[PDB]
Amino acid sequence: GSHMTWLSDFPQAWAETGGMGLAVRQAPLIIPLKATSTPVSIKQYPMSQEARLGIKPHIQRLLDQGILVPCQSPWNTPLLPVKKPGTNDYRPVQDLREVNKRVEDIHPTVPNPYNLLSGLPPSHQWYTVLDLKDAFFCLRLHPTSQPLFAFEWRDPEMGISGQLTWTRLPQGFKNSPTLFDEALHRDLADFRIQHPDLILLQYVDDLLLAATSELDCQQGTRALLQTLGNLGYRASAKKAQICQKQVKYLGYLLKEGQR
Amino acid sequence: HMTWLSDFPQAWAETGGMGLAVRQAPLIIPLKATSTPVSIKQYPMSQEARLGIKPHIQRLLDQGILVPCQSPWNTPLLPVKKPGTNDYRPVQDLREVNKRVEDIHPTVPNPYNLLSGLPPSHQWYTVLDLKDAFFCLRLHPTSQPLFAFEWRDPEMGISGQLTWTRLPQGFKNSPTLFDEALHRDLADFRIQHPDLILLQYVDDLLLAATSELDCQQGTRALLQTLGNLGYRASAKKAQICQKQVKYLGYLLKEGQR
DNA sequence: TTTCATGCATG
DNA sequence: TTTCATGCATG
Numbered sequence: 001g002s003h004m005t006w007l008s009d010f011p012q013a014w015a016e017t018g019g020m021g022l023a024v025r026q027a028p029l030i031i032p033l034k035a036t037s038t039p040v041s042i043k044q045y046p047m048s049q050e051a052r053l054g055i056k057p058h059i060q061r062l063l064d065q066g067i068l069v070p071c072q073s074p075w076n077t078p079l080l081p082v083k084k085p086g087t088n089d090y091r092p093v094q095d096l097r098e099v100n101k102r103v104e105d106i107h108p109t110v111p112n113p114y115n116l117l118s119g120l121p122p123s124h125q126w127y128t129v130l131d132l133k134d135a136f137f138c139l140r141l142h143p144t145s146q147p148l149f150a151f152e153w154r155d156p157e158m159g160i161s162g163q164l165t166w167t168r169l170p171q172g173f174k175n176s177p178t179l180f181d182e183a184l185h186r187d188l189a190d191f192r193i194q195h196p197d198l199i200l201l202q203y204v205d206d207l208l209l210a211a212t213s214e215l216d217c218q219q220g221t222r223a224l225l226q227t228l229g230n231l232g233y234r235a236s237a238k239k240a241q242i243c244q245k246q247v248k249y250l251g252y253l254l255k256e257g258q259r
Numbered sequence: 260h261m262t263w264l265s266d267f268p269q270a271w272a273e274t275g276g277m278g279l280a281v282r283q284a285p286l287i288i289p290l291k292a293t294s295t296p297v298s299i300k301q302y303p304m305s306q307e308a309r310l311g312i313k314p315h316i317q318r319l320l321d322q323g324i325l326v327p328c329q330s331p332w333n334t335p336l337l338p339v340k341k342p343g344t345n346d347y348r349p350v351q352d353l354r355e356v357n358k359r360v361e362d363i364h365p366t367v368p369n370p371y372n373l374l375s376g377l378p379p380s381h382q383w384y385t386v387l388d389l390k391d392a393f394f395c396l397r398l399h400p401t402s403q404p405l406f407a408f409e410w411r412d413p414e415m416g417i418s419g420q421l422t423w424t425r426l427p428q429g430f431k432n433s434p435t436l437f438d439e440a441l442h443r444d445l446a447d448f449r450i451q452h453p454d455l456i457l458l459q460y461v462d463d464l465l466l467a468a469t470s471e472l473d474c475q476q477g478t479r480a481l482l483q484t485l486g487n488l489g490y491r492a493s494a495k496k497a498q499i500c501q502k503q504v505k506y507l508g509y510l511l512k513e514g515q516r
Numbered sequence: 517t518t519t520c521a522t523g524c525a526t527g
Numbered sequence: 528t529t530t531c532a533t534g535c536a537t538g
Contacts, residue, residue, distance in 0.1 A: 019282075022281045024269070024281055024486070024487045024489070025269070025487070045519090045520065045521095047519085048519065050519090051519060063400060064284065064285065064399070065284065066284065066285045066397055069323075069326075069400060069424065070326050070328070070400045070403070070424075071323075071326055072326070072327050077538090078520085078521085078538095080519095080520060080521080080538075081518095081519070081520090082518065082519090082520090083518055083519065084518075085517070085518050086518095090519095093520095093537085093538060094538070095520080095521070095537095095538050096538060097521080097522080097523085097537090097538055100538080143321060143322050143323040144321055146323070157401075158400060158401055159399070159400040159401035159402070159403055159404055160400055161328075161329065171538090172537080172538050173538095174538095230487065232281065232487075
C-alpha cells in the first residue's frame with residue numbers, strides 16, 4: 001500500500017531504518033594470496049586538507065561502525081579523493097590495484113543477466129526488486145587477512161595516527177563481487193526451498209522475486225525481507241521495487257515485454 | 260550431548276570462535292573532566308616472565324584484539340604465576356586508568372538477590388556461561404589509547420605500545436558495560452518467550468523453564484539467539500535442561516546448595 | 517565526462 | 528609468445 005507500511009513492518013531489513021547490515025551466518029573470509037606475493041606498500045599521494053575533510057565524514061561513519069579499524073601492516077594502497085564534477089561532493093576510492101595483482105584470482109560464477117531473467121516463466125508476473133545497500137561491508141574479513149587493504153589515514157581527533165584497514169569486504173577488491181554473490185546464494189539457499197512457488201533471482205547484491213499473484217508476491221516479499229533481516233543483510237528502501245507488475249532489474253525491464 | 264555441539268555452530272564458542280556483538284557499536288570511554296593521560300613506567304621482566312607471557316599476546320595480535328600504538332597512556336603488565344613448571348596470565352594494572360575514567364552507576368545485580376525470584380514452577384534449568392564475553396564488545400579507536408601497554412618485540416615487529424580493541428579485562432566498567440549490553444540485546448528474546456525465565460549476571464546465564472520439553476525450545480531459541488547476536492558460550496561447561504544444576508556458586512534442585 | 521592512475525580494448 | 532595511441536571504465 002504505502003512504502004512506509006513495508007518500512008515500519010520490517011525495520012530490521014531496511015538499511016535506512018534498521019542499522020548497518022552484517023552477515024551473521026557468514027564466517028570471516030580469508031584472502032588467499034598468490035603462491036609468491038609479498039607485502040607491497042604504495043604511498044599516499046599528497047592530499048589537500050581541503051579535500052581530506054571533504055572525505056573525512058566518509059571514513060568517520062566507517063570508523064564508528066568498526067568497519068574501518070586501526071592497524072599497522074606492510075601493505076598500503078592510495079586513497080583517492082574523488083570529487084563529483086562541479087560540486088565539493090567528495091568521496092574516497094581506494095586504489096586496491098596492487099594488492100589485487102598479488103591476491104590469487106577467483107573464477108566468477110555470476111549468472112549472466114539476460115539468460116537468468118529469460119528462464120522466468122509467464123506464470124510468475126509479479127515482481128519485487130531489492131538491492132542490499134553496502135553488500136560487501138556485510139562480510140567479515142578474517143583477522144589474519146585485513147592487513148592487505150590498509151590505507152594511510154591520520155586523525156588525532158579519532159585516535160588514528162597511521163593507517164586503517166578493513167574488517168569487511170572493501171569495494172574495489174576484485175574477488176568482492178564473486179565472494180558476496182556466493183555467500184548470499186548460500187544464505188538464501190533455505191529461503192528458496194521454503195517457497196517452492198516463488199522464483200528467487202540474485203546477481204550479487206541485486207534481488208528479484210516473482211510470484212503468480214500480487215498476494216503471493218506480497219507474502220513472498222515479507223518472508224523475503226524478514227529472511228534478510230535476521231540474516232544480517234539490509235535492503236535499500238529508497239530504491240525498493242515492491243510487488244509491482246513491472247520493474248527494472250539489471251538495466252533490464254520486465255511485465256509483458258522487455259527493454 | 261553430542262547434538263548441541265553440531266546443531267548450533269554460532270551459538271557455542273567451540274564451533275563459532277571468538278564472539279562479537281553485531282548489534283553493539285565500538286564504545287567511547289568518557290574520561291573524568293580533570294583526567295589527563297598517565298605514563299606509569301613498565302616494571303622490567305625476567306626472560307622467563309617475558310617467555311611464558313609471550314604466546315599470550317601473540318594469540319592476541321593475530322586475532323586482532325591488540326594493535327600497536329604510540330599512546331601517552333601506559334599501564335604496567337604484571338607476570339602472573341600459578342603452581343608446576345611455568346604457568347602465567349597477563350594482568351594489566353589498569354587501576355590508574357580506572358581512576359581517571361568516568362565511572363558508571365552499577366547495573367549489575369546482587370548474586371543472591373537474583374536467584375531469589377526463581378519460581379518453583381520452573382524446575383527445569385539450563386546454565387550456559389558465555390566465553391570471552393567482553394571481547395564480544397569492542398572499543399572505539401578513540402578510547403583505545405587509555406589501555407595501551409609496553410611490548411618491544413621483533414617476533415611480531417613491535418617497538419611501541421599495544422592497546423585494546425575490545426572491552427579489556429581489568430577495566431572498572433567492563434562488567435557493567437557487558438551485562439548492560441547483553442541485557443540490551445537479549446530484550447526481545449524475553450518478550451518472545453514470556454513463559455521462560457531468563458537470568459543474566461554479566462557473562463553467566465540461567466534459563467528456567469517449567470517442563471523438560473519447554474526447557475528444550477527455550478535453550479534452542481536461546482543458543483539460536485546467542486549466535487546471530489555474536490555471542491559464543493562454552494558448550495563444554497554448558498548444563499542443558501537439567502533438574503539439578505549449579506549457577507553462580509549456588510546449586511539448584513528444589514531449595515539450593 | 518574529476519585534485520590521480522591506468523589496464524584494456526579499440527581504431 | 529606483441530606492434531603504436533588513446534578514450535573510458537574502474538581502482
